[PDB]
Amino acid sequence: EDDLKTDFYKDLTSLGHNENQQGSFSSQGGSSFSVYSSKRSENINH
């Protein structure tokens, strides 16, 4: 008798995740007052 049995199993899995994100919020305001005087201004960046 000569009986030879063999198995080879290989599994490979690979995964990739890559994310690049930006968000900008920009608000500006100015008001001017006349006759008295005033000036008022606002600038935000989020």
UniProtKB/Swiss-Prot annotation:
Component of the membrane attack complex (MAC), composed of complement C5b, C6, C7, C8A, C8B, C8G and multiple copies of the pore-forming subunit C9. Belongs to the complement C6/C7/C8/C9 family. All cysteine residues are assumed to be cross-linked to one another. Individual modules containing an even number of conserved cysteine residues are supposed to have disulfide linkages only within the same module. It is linked to Complement component 6 deficiency: A rare defect of the complement classical pathway associated with susceptibility to severe recurrent infections, predominantly by Neisseria gonorrhoeae or Neisseria meningitidis. The chain crosses the membrane at residues 32-41. The chain holds residues 247 to 295 of 934 of the full protein. This is Complement component C6. It is found in: Secreted; Target cell membrane.
